[PDB]
Amino acid sequence: RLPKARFIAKSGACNLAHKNIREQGRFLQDIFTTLVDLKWRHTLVIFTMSFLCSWLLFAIMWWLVAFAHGDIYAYMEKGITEKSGLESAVCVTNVRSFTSAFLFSIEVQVTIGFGGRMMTEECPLAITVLILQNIVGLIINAVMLGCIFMKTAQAHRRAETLIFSRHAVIAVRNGKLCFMFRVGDLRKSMIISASVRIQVVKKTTTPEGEVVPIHQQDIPVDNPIESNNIFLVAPLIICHVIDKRSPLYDISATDLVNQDLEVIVILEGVVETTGITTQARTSYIAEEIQWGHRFVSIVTEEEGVYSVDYSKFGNTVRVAAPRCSARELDEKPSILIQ
Amino acid sequence: MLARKSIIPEEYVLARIAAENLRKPRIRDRLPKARFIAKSGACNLAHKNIREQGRFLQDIFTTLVDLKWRHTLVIFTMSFLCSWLLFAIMWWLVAFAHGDIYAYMEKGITEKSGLESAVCVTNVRSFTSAFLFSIEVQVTIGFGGRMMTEECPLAITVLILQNIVGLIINAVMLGCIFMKTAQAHRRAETLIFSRHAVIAVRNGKLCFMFRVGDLRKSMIISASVRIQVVKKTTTPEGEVVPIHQQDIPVDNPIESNNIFLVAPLIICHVIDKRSPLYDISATDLVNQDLEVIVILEGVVETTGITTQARTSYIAEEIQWGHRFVSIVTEEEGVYSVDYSKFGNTVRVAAPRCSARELDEKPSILI
Ligand SMILES: Nc1ncnc2c1ncn2[C@@H]1O[C@H](COP(=O)(O)OP(=O)(O)OP(=O)(O)O)[C@@H](O)[C@H]1O
Ligand SMILES: Nc1ncnc2c1ncn2[C@@H]1O[C@H](COP(=O)(O)OP(=O)(O)OP(=O)(O)O)[C@@H](O)[C@H]1O
Numbered sequence: 001r002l003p004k005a006r007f008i009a010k011s012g013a014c015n016l017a018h019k020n021i022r023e024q025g026r027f028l029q030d031i032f033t034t035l036v037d038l039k040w041r042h043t044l045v046i047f048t049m050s051f052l053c054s055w056l057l058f059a060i061m062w063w064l065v066a067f068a069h070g071d072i073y074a075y076m077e078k079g080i081t082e083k084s085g086l087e088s089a090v091c092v093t094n095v096r097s098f099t100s101a102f103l104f105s106i107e108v109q110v111t112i113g114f115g116g117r118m119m120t121e122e123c124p125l126a127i128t129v130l131i132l133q134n135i136v137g138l139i140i141n142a143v144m145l146g147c148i149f150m151k152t153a154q155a156h157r158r159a160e161t162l163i164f165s166r167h168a169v170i171a172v173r174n175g176k177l178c179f180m181f182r183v184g185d186l187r188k189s190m191i192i193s194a195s196v197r198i199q200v201v202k203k204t205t206t207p208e209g210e211v212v213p214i215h216q217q218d219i220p221v222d223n224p225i226e227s228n229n230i231f232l233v234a235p236l237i238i239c240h241v242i243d244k245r246s247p248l249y250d251i252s253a254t255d256l257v258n259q260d261l262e263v264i265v266i267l268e269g270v271v272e273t274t275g276i277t278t279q280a281r282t283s284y285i286a287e288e289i290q291w292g293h294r295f296v297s298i299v300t301e302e303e304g305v306y307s308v309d310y311s312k313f314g315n316t317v318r319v320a321a322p323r324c325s326a327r328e329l330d331e332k333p334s335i336l337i338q
Numbered sequence: 339m340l341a342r343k344s345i346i347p348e349e350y351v352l353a354r355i356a357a358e359n360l361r362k363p364r365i366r367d368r369l370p371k372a373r374f375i376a377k378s379g380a381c382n383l384a385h386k387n388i389r390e391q392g393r394f395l396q397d398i399f400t401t402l403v404d405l406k407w408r409h410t411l412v413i414f415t416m417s418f419l420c421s422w423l424l425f426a427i428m429w430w431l432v433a434f435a436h437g438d439i440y441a442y443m444e445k446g447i448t449e450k451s452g453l454e455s456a457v458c459v460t461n462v463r464s465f466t467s468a469f470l471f472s473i474e475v476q477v478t479i480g481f482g483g484r485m486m487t488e489e490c491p492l493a494i495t496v497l498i499l500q501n502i503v504g505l506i507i508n509a510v511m512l513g514c515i516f517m518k519t520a521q522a523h524r525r526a527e528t529l530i531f532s533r534h535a536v537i538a539v540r541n542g543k544l545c546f547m548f549r550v551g552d553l554r555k556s557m558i559i560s561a562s563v564r565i566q567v568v569k570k571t572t573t574p575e576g577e578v579v580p581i582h583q584q585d586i587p588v589d590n591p592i593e594s595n596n597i598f599l600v601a602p603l604i605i606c607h608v609i610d611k612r613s614p615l616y617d618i619s620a621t622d623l624v625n626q627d628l629e630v631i632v633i634l635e636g637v638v639e640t641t642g643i644t645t646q647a648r649t650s651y652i653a654e655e656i657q658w659g660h661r662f663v664s665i666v667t668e669e670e671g672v673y674s675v676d677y678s679k680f681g682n683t684v685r686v687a688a689p690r691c692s693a694r695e696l697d698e699k700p701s702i703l704i
């Protein structure tokens with residue numbers, strides 16, 4: 001039926017729905033930012049279209065400025081008269097058609113300037129138009145150059161690359177139940193200063209009466225040294241041991257599948273090749289937690305080097321796990337201990 | 339040609355030293371060795387049978403940005419030459435079709451005409467001229483003895499197409515050059531490690547020590563030291579953890595994992611109960627399947643890039659009973675260190691028992 005709520009999905013990307021946020025209006029800086037945040041298939045198109053539109057716009061202006069002076073009349077009557085009676089008076093030499101104005105604009109801005117179409121020193125309006133057009137062309141070229149530099153810089157990153165298991169396990173390890181999951185890497189480099197944090201999502205209350213709605217917490221990931229940095233070259237099985245103080249201690253075994261909990265995993269680090277800090281997220285819910293199972297080993301010795309095979313990443317076989325809550329194993333040994 | 343037609347000689351006699359020498363072992367171990375990471379970085383694992391994700395052209399561009407400086411110039415030059423040539427051929431075909439080549443040849447064979455009033459693209463007469471006109475249009479030179487009259491609109495289309503593509507080429511190549519010039523400090527990493535490891539006696543318990551130093555005149559900031567032991571174990575309930583990496587404390591005055599790296603240092607590691615080195619003895623520590631990894635992290639203030647340096651130790655290289663010679667020495671007016679005494683180790687009084695028992699038998703004597 002209607003889906004029961006999750007906090008963050010099976011592919012990260014927190015599903016929260018902020019609503020009625022007090023928003024301000026438009027900051028055109030946001031539009032420019034969209035300009036730099038683009039796809040190449042569209043960046044190339046707008047890049048070309050800017051130049052095409054600019055040339056056409058200044059071509060129409062150039063035709064008008066060739067219209068104002070006595071230019072078109074002179075070049076239309078010279079053909080009839082076949083007389084060189086218009087040698088020097090014209091405003092922009094040999095500009096006599098909208099096509100010719102368009103060609104002159106192309107010549108002037110990309111700095112081609114073939115030089116058969118000279119620009120005299122007479123019509124001040126024309127000199128104003130030339131100054132304006134040259135400045136606009138310089139600005140446009142600089143902006144697009146900046147766009148290309150940002151594109152090249154943001155080329156290297158492709159997509160998130162740290163991979164978490166289909167589901168997790170809850171095994172028995174060293175005389176106390178432990179929550180385990182599997183994390184792997186697909187990169188060529190390795191993640192510097194990697195860190196892993198685990199959280200328990202549960203709707204909670206406080207004994208004195210306050211109400212906490214989607215409260216977070218944190219569960220102590222274990223190392224023999226009480227520290228959280230982890231080095232990831234082989235696929236790893238992150239583990240967390242159940243103590244009396246984690247909220248993952250009073251749950252039962254059979255009745256986990258019908259129980260309101262969520263386990264969020266956050267893995268951060270800094271990539272060595274390009275030096276960009278990254279954070280990858282995932283979550284496990286009640287429906288996708290297989291109690292009492294355990295992961296099979298995947299690293300073996302191939303007589304030349306160690307060898308692992310991620311094709312067998314998510315397979316998980318069931319082995320022994322006592323049918324009691326992780327509390328019953330310590331409050332009353334005779335209840336569980338055997 | 340048919341070397342061994344006469345096949346008759348078979349099983350007459352061989353009867354020889356092939357393995358029945360009896361004074362030489364028949365076996366040939368051949369001594370192959372596998373370590374978790376090579377002695378000089380380059381983690382050597384074996385990923386295979388991974389569900390592949392195909393390829394995408396953005397990866398080709400990503401390769402374009404990451405090239406050695408002796409290939410960027412080559413791809414630059416090839417790109418420029420190919421572009422000029424391609425548009426030269428387009429211009430040559432345009433000149434051919436519109437009847438310009440014939441007009442120029444016929445009216446220049448006899449100079450009587452001098453007619454250039456009806457031509458598609460003036461003063462293009464050969465492929466040489468077309469491959470000099472395309473030069474004058476792409477690089478924004480514009481020599482201008484060859485105007486483009488306004489008539490033939492196909493030529494104008496070609497000019498628009500070529501100018502825009504030329505700008506694209508110029509912008510992309512400038513971007514590549516700038517990106518490679520900005521990230522030009524980033525040569526490589528030059529962290530120097532001692533190779534041999536001692537287990538001396540100091541401060542009432544054993545140790546685990548080596549030496550590390552830099553070469554760049556910039557010291558490394560927020561340097562952190564991590565030491566791990568690689569071994570295969572199983573749960574008491576019996577599950578194969580294939581290559582368990584166990585973290586072990588590196589001692590320090592306040593138990594924190596930063597180190598300040600200016601003069602080379604000893605990196606101690608006191609063996610205590612939790613440490614996996616509790617159970618290793620003198621004659622034992624030549625035979626063992628263990629690999630101790632060391633991970634050094636920091637940033638270099640000059641380039642502003644985070645760096646991670648890796649090395650690996652095996653039980654075979656580690657030589658019990660030694661320590662490191664005091665490389666430093668107060669000189670005439672200023673301290674100094676001779677890195678030439680890097681791998682040099684000396685021997686001194688070394689107990690031969692295990693730290694497992696160096697508290698069990700409570701006599702500092704062994
Ligand atoms: N919805 C919101 N959007 C943006 N900023 C907010 C929002 N709510 C609170 N803030 C920030 O918190 C502070 C709230 O102070 P303020 O005195 O405006 O509270 P308030 O608006 O009276 O609260 P309420 O409207 O809920 O009664 C402000 O500085 C504001 O920047
Ligand atoms: N060998 C592999 N090669 C490439 N990607 C992998 C590999 N193993 C796992 N992944 C990635 O890790 C994620 C988790 O895979 P997992 O094995 O946990 O799920 P799964 O049930 O095997 O998924 P599927 O049913 O699609 O095979 C997947 O989305 C997948 O993209």
Ligand SMILES: Nc1ncnc2c1ncn2[C@@H]1O[C@H](COP(=O)(O)OP(=O)(O)OP(=O)(O)O)[C@@H](O)[C@H]1O
Pocket residue numbers: 530531532533677678679680681682
């Ligand atoms: N003066 C030095 N310059 C550069 N590297 C050094 C120097 N001294 C030692 N090393 C490093 O120490 C590591 C061990 O090398 P090796 O065992 O061949 O020499 P060593 O005994 O440590 O020192 P030496 O060669 O001075 O006797 C090498 O990786 C090497 O790079």
